[PDB]
Subunit: 543 residues, 3 copies
Amino acid sequence: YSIEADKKFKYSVKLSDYPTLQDAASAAVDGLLIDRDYNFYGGETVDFGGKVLTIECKAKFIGDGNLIFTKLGKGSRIAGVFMESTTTPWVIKPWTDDNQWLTDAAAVVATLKQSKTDGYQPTVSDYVKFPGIETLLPPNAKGQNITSTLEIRECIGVEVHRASGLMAGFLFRGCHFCKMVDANNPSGGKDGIITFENLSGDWGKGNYVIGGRTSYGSVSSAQFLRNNGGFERDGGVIGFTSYRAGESGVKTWQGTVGSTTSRNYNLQFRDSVVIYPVADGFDLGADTDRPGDYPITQYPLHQLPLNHLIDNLLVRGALGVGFGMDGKGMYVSNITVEDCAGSGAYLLTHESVFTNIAIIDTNTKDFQANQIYISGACRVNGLRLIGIRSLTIDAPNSTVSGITGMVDPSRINVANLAEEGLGNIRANSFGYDSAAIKLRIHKLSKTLDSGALYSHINGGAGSGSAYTQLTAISGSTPDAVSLKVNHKDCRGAEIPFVPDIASDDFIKDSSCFLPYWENNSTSLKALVKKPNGELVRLTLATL
Amino acid sequence: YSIEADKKFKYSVKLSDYPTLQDAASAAVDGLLIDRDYNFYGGETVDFGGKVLTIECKAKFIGDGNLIFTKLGKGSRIAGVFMESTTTPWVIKPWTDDNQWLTDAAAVVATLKQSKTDGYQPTVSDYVKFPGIETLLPPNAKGQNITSTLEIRECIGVEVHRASGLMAGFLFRGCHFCKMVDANNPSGGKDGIITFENLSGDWGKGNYVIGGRTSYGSVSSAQFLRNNGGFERDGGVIGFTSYRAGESGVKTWQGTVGSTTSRNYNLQFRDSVVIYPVADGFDLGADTDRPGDYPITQYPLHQLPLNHLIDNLLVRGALGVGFGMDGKGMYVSNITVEDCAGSGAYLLTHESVFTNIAIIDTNTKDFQANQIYISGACRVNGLRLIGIRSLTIDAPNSTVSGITGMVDPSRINVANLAEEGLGNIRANSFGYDSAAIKLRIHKLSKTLDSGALYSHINGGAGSGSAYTQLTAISGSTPDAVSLKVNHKDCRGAEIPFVPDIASDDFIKDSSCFLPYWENNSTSLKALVKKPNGELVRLTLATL
Amino acid sequence: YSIEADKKFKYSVKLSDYPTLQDAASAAVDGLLIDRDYNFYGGETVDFGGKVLTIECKAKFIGDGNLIFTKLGKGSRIAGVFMESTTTPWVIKPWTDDNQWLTDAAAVVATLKQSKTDGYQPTVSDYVKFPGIETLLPPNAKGQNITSTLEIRECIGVEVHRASGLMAGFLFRGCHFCKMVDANNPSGGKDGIITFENLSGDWGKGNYVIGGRTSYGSVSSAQFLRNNGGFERDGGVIGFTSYRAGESGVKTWQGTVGSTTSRNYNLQFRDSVVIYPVADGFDLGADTDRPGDYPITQYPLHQLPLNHLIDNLLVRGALGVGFGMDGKGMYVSNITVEDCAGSGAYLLTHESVFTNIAIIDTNTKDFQANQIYISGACRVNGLRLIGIRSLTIDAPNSTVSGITGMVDPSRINVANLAEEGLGNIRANSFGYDSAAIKLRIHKLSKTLDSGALYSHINGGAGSGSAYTQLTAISGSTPDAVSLKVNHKDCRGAEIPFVPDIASDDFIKDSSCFLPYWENNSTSLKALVKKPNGELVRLTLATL
């Protein structure tokens, strides 16, 4: 029988048969079932002998600190892992029962409670976020560092599916071709919930976060350090949801970490949602003299050729910036940012193109100077601004086209704004006695329209009559001077004349005449510039 | 050997070794394989003893009625379950071989056949949908109620993957943190194909429909009752496809069901597609005096703070409404609705913002009064209307900006329409001898333009000459009065004058003159309003 | 014990216990583990006896040619299969270290190396792509045909999950309801990486590519032949990523293949990305007299009722066309195409509607005549053109609305262009001393504006003064003739007069007068068309 049984049954060892996880790991052949809770000590390391194992979790890994899995064969998969700390730390919950953000330090300190979820352990960044909280926080709620972390170390081709936990953390250190798939809403701890760190060895490649969601955590939900997906863009965050990150939803590190670069290149950030981050929705910047990376002489600050593939992202409820990034020659598209306390978009980009961006009701708490900021020479094609609620857009060097929304024109600052390819046009006016087409030269004034083409009703609704008027501003009074056609259904043109003797320099073109008033004789004269260019004054109208 | 075998093999019991499913359930430890068809009786209940089991299905569960699974441990998963009724009921197929909807009751009754798919069992809602069908339907095709339903009862953390079936139904009753993942196109029965019902106990939370598709069914494909995902938006429908729902593709219930509220809050409806529903694509309304919910005094009808996260939805071929909803303070974005028989969007929303909405060829069968309806004070930023095919939009209290499409201006009714932030403009005219910029004051007339700025060719193409004309409507005749510049390349301005003695009240502003005709002397006079405001009549032109 | 063990353990056979795969297949009951590398010979066929098996791969299938799996029961799934050729062929890598495409044949031939990845085996299509490469390529780099292919033959309900490999290929021949799920980035060989071929038997249905990615390959990544998903749109490519396809990312075949039609109907192509294809991103055409398909008399060339559900696609870096297709009555939406060497969109469609299309920086290498081409009578609603970089759009028979971007108006050719539903308008000018609203009649000239309404600053910034001017082109000189209001803050209207005796035909409407010059008397006369229609010449201004 044994011979037969050995060839007809599925191999699998279970943790309940062993005293330690390593013993179970040493016995494992094909499968390994975690069928009983296992308390680990920080630093507990498990060597899997390069075996391609299928680890199925039906119990928890309990402990503060890291549980290190090493030497897993390419193709190994862990499903259902639940990480839980042994400590229940002090957490703050900076939002009300109506889901209103609390920005007052005393108000936030008042939210203190011991819990493994529904809030996060304060960090130094909070000292900056809620001014004066550092002096208000009790010593026991400061400097905490609780996180039950599963650390996968220097492995290739390992995938973690449907992971979960309380005060949980997932760290891939020195890994390649690993994926965090369908994270089953783990509640974060002190460190990043999902981190791909490659500060040593080769730049991380093939590392992804695919689907799923996370909640809470003191810092960022998903984060990468020194990863480069290459031209193939092998790596990134796709179809992921982050909720209430103590810092940002998705973050690519900036500057020098340790003695090398923590920057990232050629990654994908697509089809993802980030809601209510205490900081930013997406922090995709690289710079904050670049050991391990491009020198400043080659690429100036904020001008690295990051080349991330960025598309179809949604951000809502950020206490900070909805979408932030830097870099040169970037192509960004289909970004929707709604209801943010600080800037919806803070762009330190140069020679980049943004297509179909929607920034709806951001900088609601005046944290920044604008709803959207772009520093370098960029191109924006399609920009929807204003929802139902300081400049709106400040992109001094960018060329914009296609803005939609109830924007205040005096709150727009760009290098150039133009609609070169519209067809025949119709201005449809609703709720008013007139329709209008206004012209505003921002060099003359950002607050006053310089001219206009109106159409006003003559009489009342259904009169079948209106008068058209062409105007010009004078003395900073918009519409001061104007020509009308059909005022009071009279069917004639009302023409404005110089109230006094017209000076020679008033007339501009030849073969034109400019009517002017001669009060001393109750006459209307006409300064005429003959087709030959000569000036002559003629009597136009008299008694 | 036994000792060894016990520790080296994967545990799993199979249904072929047991007489009843409960016996197999009682023996199960880790896995459970359904390797033979099992005929169940309606109400057959299986108790899983709180075990975290992995149920793998390779056969069918055959029976009309419900197969109840209870006490499954958190973390249990069922994969490949196939539900099939024993009865082959009478189904109608209200669409032609060219995929044309049949709206004639006699035509639909003619489609009757006995089948477990490719149509659905008629319900009372069909009596309303196809007028007079109630009296045409034969008694045996009426009041049917066939559905082979897998009911998961009061469980937490249970997931059903790749489920399928014929006349199938999946009901999660009193469940939390359960998911319907990658539904492998089950063909629906009488009840909802996927239902998350929490009328008892706590409001459902953590319940999702992730990916997959369903086909047919008498009512809605995916539906929720009394679920609240909280601020974290823990729950919803993401990446799902519904085809030919007898009622709606995705539905959140409204009003009182039983003695409590069936309404839903804080759910996600994203990245989904609904094609050919007999009713609506997405029915996300809450109201149709609210036991178990907010009182009408707190929140008026259709003004509940639903707070669903709604983004990136597509609807095509609905016989009803493509996208419907109500609520207050909602943010909706990236919705595309094409080819619908009734309203593309029916919005009973107040103080809500809609961003980037595309309603293409809807209300093709004049079922409603408009293509898109919005009742309350809302904001629309980006609205694409008209494809290749009664008002188009009726949003009496909403402010709109950025409409694109070959819309008929007289079919637009809104509170305000404006393009405040456009840059320098160019009207490009193709296929015509002129380009135009028209002004229409809807208060004066919704069908006639009140004024215009044109450019017309002088001579023919390539003449290098055109004349500009500013016009005004009079006597309900558009362009009745006008001023021209360069008519017939003459290089002069043609000016309109009052055909008779101009009345004092005709002139509007000081320092202006209005030419008028004096027929009795073949003279052109001029009513002049001096810079001081006084009126004087002067002789302008004479023989 | 045996009795007990037989009922409590999970069944599974492993390849290491058998000499051939068929032996293992014959012994398999529930599971089958590929735990050792298996070298197969081309054509090696495995019969699975109609068993519903779960094949788990932890090793490779090594061989050039096809490994044929037949008679797998409905519900079978293969996970982790790794295909690898035994031959390391010669591959070209037509892109530089800066990810620049090489278009020079000598430059591309210089990239030759023997490798199983990072390039592809040249095919005849390359002879066309890189002109003269055919004569430059060494005989050993020509006519290669290396591909380690897993062929699933005539099966139903079989799914392949997380497949991978080197010079790998996956062929579903005569299959239905099969899916290629989460392809784990296999590197392609000579043939298509994922092919659903149904040239025999019924049209393929229920066949999908769901998620995942592929890299390289000589031809197309995902491709279908003679598949029809029906009205239910049961089949397609959803959430897939293709990188560097030797031909196209996603392709539906055209014309007659063998003796029948290779065309496809009713499929879905949604939520997918195609980057750097040597040819096209998406080739969704059907035509290139249609055996097995609709006759040309019924549907003319390029006018088949394809009915694919196409939405949310992204294409970047194509050396060819970003998005191509043909067909009649199609609805296409949310397509974003960036940085392509040839046309971003080549549309041989008729009576179709395109909604929200963004073509950003395409035809960068002038491979085509335009960035976007549409042949038939189509409708485009929302078109974003030009990024940061020959006509831009050539759609002679289409009606367009809502173009955004810094487009050159002379590079637009359409049947009609109009913005019928805009509200009140404001032209905001930045960086200039004037704002403008220009009119261009393309029939008169595609390069010169025929008229304009300007607003120019009087003096300098902050003067609070500007002058409005209405102009008209004459002698092919734009703005030749104009009327001004407030030039030099004079507050009067400067009016242009005919430089000579105005001819009778110059005046257009009755009750109007046209000033003209009478040089022989230094007088200004006026040609007047009385309200009765009669002409009279009056003296207007004199000395």
